[PDB]
Design an enzyme around this catalytic site. Structure first.
Site, PDB file in Angstrom:
ATOM      1  N   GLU A 252       0.775  -1.348   0.056  1.00  0.00           N
ATOM      2  CA  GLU A 252      -0.019   0.033  -0.091  1.00  0.00           C
ATOM      3  C   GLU A 252       0.940   1.256   0.080  1.00  0.00           C
ATOM      4  O   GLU A 252       0.568   2.257  -0.784  1.00  0.00           O
ATOM      5  CB  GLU A 252      -0.787  -0.068   1.277  1.00  0.00           C
ATOM      6  CG  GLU A 252      -1.596   1.327   1.674  1.00  0.00           C
ATOM      7  CD  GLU A 252      -2.072   1.438   2.811  1.00  0.00           C
ATOM      8  OE1 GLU A 252      -3.385   0.531   3.058  1.00  0.00           O
ATOM      9  OE2 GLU A 252      -1.671   1.862   4.051  1.00  0.00           O
TER      10      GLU A 252
ATOM     11  N   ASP B  84      -5.940  -4.182  -3.692  1.00  0.00           N
ATOM     12  CA  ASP B  84      -6.173  -2.986  -3.623  1.00  0.00           C
ATOM     13  C   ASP B  84      -4.890  -1.987  -3.978  1.00  0.00           C
ATOM     14  O   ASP B  84      -4.906  -0.963  -4.615  1.00  0.00           O
ATOM     15  CB  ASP B  84      -6.872  -2.453  -2.453  1.00  0.00           C
ATOM     16  CG  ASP B  84      -6.259  -2.297  -1.360  1.00  0.00           C
ATOM     17  OD1 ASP B  84      -5.280  -3.299  -1.263  1.00  0.00           O
ATOM     18  OD2 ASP B  84      -6.446  -1.703  -0.434  1.00  0.00           O
TER      19      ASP B  84
HETATM   20  O1  LIG Z   1      -9.882   0.190  11.218  1.00  0.00           O
HETATM   21  C1  LIG Z   1      -9.252   1.105  11.746  1.00  0.00           C
HETATM   22  C2  LIG Z   1      -8.183   1.573  10.837  1.00  0.00           C
HETATM   23  O2  LIG Z   1      -7.085   0.402  10.658  1.00  0.00           O
HETATM   24  C3  LIG Z   1      -7.248   2.639  11.670  1.00  0.00           C
HETATM   25  O3  LIG Z   1      -6.371   1.975  12.288  1.00  0.00           O
HETATM   26  C4  LIG Z   1      -6.555   3.490  10.352  1.00  0.00           C
HETATM   27  O4  LIG Z   1      -5.592   2.876   9.794  1.00  0.00           O
HETATM   28  C5  LIG Z   1      -5.367   2.527   8.487  1.00  0.00           C
HETATM   29  O5  LIG Z   1      -6.228   1.415   8.662  1.00  0.00           O
HETATM   30  C6  LIG Z   1      -6.326   1.130   7.113  1.00  0.00           C
HETATM   31  C7  LIG Z   1      -7.367   0.204   6.998  1.00  0.00           C
HETATM   32  O6  LIG Z   1      -6.989  -1.178   7.447  1.00  0.00           O
HETATM   33  C8  LIG Z   1      -4.820   0.483   6.468  1.00  0.00           C
HETATM   34  O7  LIG Z   1      -4.863   0.360   5.405  1.00  0.00           O
HETATM   35  C9  LIG Z   1      -3.783   1.901   6.822  1.00  0.00           C
HETATM   36  O8  LIG Z   1      -2.531   1.324   6.552  1.00  0.00           O
HETATM   37  C10 LIG Z   1      -3.942   2.179   8.050  1.00  0.00           C
HETATM   38  O9  LIG Z   1      -2.942   3.399   8.361  1.00  0.00           O
HETATM   39  C11 LIG Z   1      -5.810   4.805  11.228  1.00  0.00           C
HETATM   40  O10 LIG Z   1      -6.909   5.455  11.964  1.00  0.00           O
HETATM   41  C12 LIG Z   1      -5.373   5.958  10.188  1.00  0.00           C
HETATM   42  O11 LIG Z   1      -6.077   6.009   9.320  1.00  0.00           O
END
Ligand SMILES: O=C[C@H](O)[C@@H](O)[C@H](O[C@@H]1O[C@H](CO)[C@@H](O)[C@H](O)[C@H]1O)[C@H](O)CO
Ligand code: CA
Length: 629
Positions: free
Chosen positions: A55, A230
């Site tokens: 990602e 994705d």
């Molecule tokens: O479900 C809650 C999320 O995981 C948060 O912890 C956010 O983290 C981001 O989540 C996405 C989806 O899993 C990841 O792809 C990404 O790498 C994380 O940074 C958090 O609030 C920051 O946006």
């Protein structure tokens, strides 16, 4: 020559780019790989700050492409693809063709059930259970002359913090690792980090293998890789813009376009049911494409023997709307420059595009937000779909696909990340399906953006759901889903999600003329720039509510199983998260975090997530291009 761009926002992009590439800021490792975040004390998807993901690489490509658009220099973009291919796409040494070429397309893998609780693992393999046929492997080996797969493994231990090393040497970096393995209830806090290349040198008697899979005999030495669809799709998306922008300046990124096209060809493995069962009739083995849902599933994975020749490949039965990418599909099926070399590459992606837009519409709630998704494998064991459950082409609706701790669709981020791709598609083609989706969604979110007098703002952070969509009838179309509702549990100031939201609104506004979307997009960018900047980009203080799990989260280990992590930590029943990651106690932020938990408070952090910073940069670039005045 490229069209004029808004000076103000172009400079904001160039400023952010400099902060992100600034050696002193530390966003990259010495090998040029971007970290998940500057700060190391980090647990949310990966469980360590300096671990990277496919990602992050895709965001690194997007960042550099935009840089190419404003500087005329595309060497950075080409460099991002070099680093990717070198470190995240398993080389001939990591996925030996001797094993991959022994792959049997008529028997892709051996069935193993999924469980709703980590304590039910290891999952027992069952050769008696049916598995369908792989229809695309012949197309790929034929066009590329190899059995190796060209896709990115999703997570990497950049500085070998866990000690697994490269192919079990324990000392090389970067290090291929994986975490999630035990179902929907296994959060980031309940995993047992394991190496992708398992020679039994670390962990237990048979490495980490018998923690997850139980065979009739002795676990063989083996490698396994897992793709994050994705991310690979985003890489295709970014490469397309890099190509467009390069040609507008008489430059070229021909080499990178090829890598992206090949990646997109292989990405089709995400179009199939995990064990290739027929879509809509999970009890039967598929006979080819009758096992393709044509959506970007949660993943596709492959592995093989290290000491003996054999291999397997699996798709995924679970589909989340947040993973879809209509734009990447449009590119790979209609642009001659991105036409996959395989016989059916372009045509399959053509089918994916139409199937994806139907998926989005089917999940659009009464309010406008997009609901979770669907699965072809109820409870991950191909069980009977409960009566009354809505379906999409025979697949049962699931509110929180794949993960429930926390629910995969309770994070607002999935809304903007995925709809931003619909907005790009709408901008480029004016497609009617995309418009119908954005008009409603954009009106919903525009009513949830709150601007305060002191310059700060808030947007939805955590959401919840009620009901389900009406069963999809292709010839009937959107019914309005009056019984599917979204609820905003709480708001926040997540700078990454806010940037993605701006991006989405800008593309939509540029094509529709909707002033509300444009001014909200600009106000977000201005607010973030004016009130949240620092010498490393942008940030804000946020609460880490789950950090208490650092100490009180027990990790499940099977009775009688004992092993050691490379650093010596003993793995056995009773261990907590921190017990198998004792090096975290040396982290500069450890004492501060523990002090807060002891005082009964919620820890807080000021984080610099790589994707978030890039998201903000790109958002500024997009705005500068679409609104030059
Ligand atoms: O479900 C809650 C999320 O995981 C948060 O912890 C956010 O983290 C981001 O989540 C996405 C989806 O899993 C990841 O792809 C990404 O790498 C994380 O940074 C958090 O609030 C920051 O946006
Ligand atoms: Ca759990």
């Amino acid at each position: 020559a490229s069209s004029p761009a808004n000076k103000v926002y172009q400079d904001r992009f160039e400023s952010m780019y400099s902060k992100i590439k600034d050696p002193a800021n530390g966003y990259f490792s010495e090998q040029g790989i971007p970290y998940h975040s500057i700060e190391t004390l980090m647990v949310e998807a990966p469980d360590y700050g300096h671990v990277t993901t496919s990602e992050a690489m895709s965001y690194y490509m997007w960042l550099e492409a935009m840089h190419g658009r404003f500087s005329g220099d595309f060497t950075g973009f080409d460099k991002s693809w070099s680093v990717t291919e070198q470190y995240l796409i398993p080389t001939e040494k990591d996925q030996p063709n001797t094993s991959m070429s022994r792959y049997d397309a008529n028997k892709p893998a051996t069935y193993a059930p999924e469980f709703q609780d980590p304590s039910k693992y290891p999952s027992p393999l069952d050769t008696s259970q049916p598995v369908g046929r792989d229809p695309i492997n012949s197309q790929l080996t034929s066009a590329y002359g190899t059995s190796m797969l060209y896709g990115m493994h999703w997570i990497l231990d950049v500085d070998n913090w866990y000690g697994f090393g490269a192919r079990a040497d324990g000392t090389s970096k970067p290090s291929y690792i994986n975490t999630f393995q035990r179902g929907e209830q296994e959060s980031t806090w309940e995993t047992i980090p394991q190496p992708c290349w398992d020679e039994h040198k670390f962990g237990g008697q048979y490495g980490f293998l018998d923690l997850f899979t139980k065979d009739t005999g002795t676990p063989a030495k083996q490698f396994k890789y897992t793709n994050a669809p994705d991310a690979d799709a985003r890489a295709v998306q970014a490469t397309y813009w890099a190509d467009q922008w390069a040609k507008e300046q008489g430059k070229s990124v021909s080499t990178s376009v090829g890598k992206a096209t090949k990646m997109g060809d292989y990405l089709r493995y995400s179009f199939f049911d995990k064990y290739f069962r027929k879509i809509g009739q999970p009890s039967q083995a598929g006979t080819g494409y009758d096992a393709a849902h044509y959506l970007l599933s949660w993943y596709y994975a492959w592995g093989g023997g290290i000491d003996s020749t054999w291999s397997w490949i699996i798709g995924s039965s679970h589909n989340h709307f947040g993973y879809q990418n209509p734009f990447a599909a449009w590119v790979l099926s209609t642009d001659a420059n991105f036409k996959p070399k395989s016989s059916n590459g372009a045509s399959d992606w053509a089918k994916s595009l139409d199937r994806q837009l139907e998926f989005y519409q089917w999940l659009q709630s009464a309010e406008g937000a997009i609901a979770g998704g669907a699965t072809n494998s109820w409870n991950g064991r191909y069980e009977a779909v409960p009566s009354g459950t809505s379906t999409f082409y025979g697949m049962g609706y699931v509110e929180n696909p794949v993960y429930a701790d926390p629910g995969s669709n309770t994070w607002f981020g999935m809304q903007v990340w995925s709809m931003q791709r619909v907005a790009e598609l709408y901008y480029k083609t004016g497609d009617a399906r995309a418009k119908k989706l954005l008009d409603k969604w954009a009106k919903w979110i525009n009513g949830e953006i709150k601007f305060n007098a002191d310059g700060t703002f808030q947007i939805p952070s955590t959401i919840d759901w009620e009901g389900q969509p009406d069963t999809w009838n292709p010839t009937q179309g959107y019914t309005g889903n009056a019984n599917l509702h979204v609820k905003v549990v709480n708001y926040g100031t997540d700078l990454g999600c806010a940037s993605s939201l701006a991006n989405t609104l800008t593309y939509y506004a540029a094509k529709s003329g909707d002033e509300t979307s444009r001014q909200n997009a600009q106000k977000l960018l201005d607010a973030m720039w004016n009130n949240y900047s620092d010498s490393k980009g942008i940030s804000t203080v946020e609460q880490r509510g789950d950090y208490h799990r650092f100490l009180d989260q027990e990790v499940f280990v099977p009775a009688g199983w004992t092993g050691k992590m490379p650093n010596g930590d003993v793995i056995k029943s009773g261990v907590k998260f921190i017990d198998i990651r004792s090096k975290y106690k040396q982290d500069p932020e450890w004492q501060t975090m523990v002090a807060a938990l002891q005082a009964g408070q919620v820890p807080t952090q000021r984080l610099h997530r790589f994707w978030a910073q890039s998201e903000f940069a790109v958002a500024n670039g997009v705005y500068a291009i679409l609104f030059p005045d």
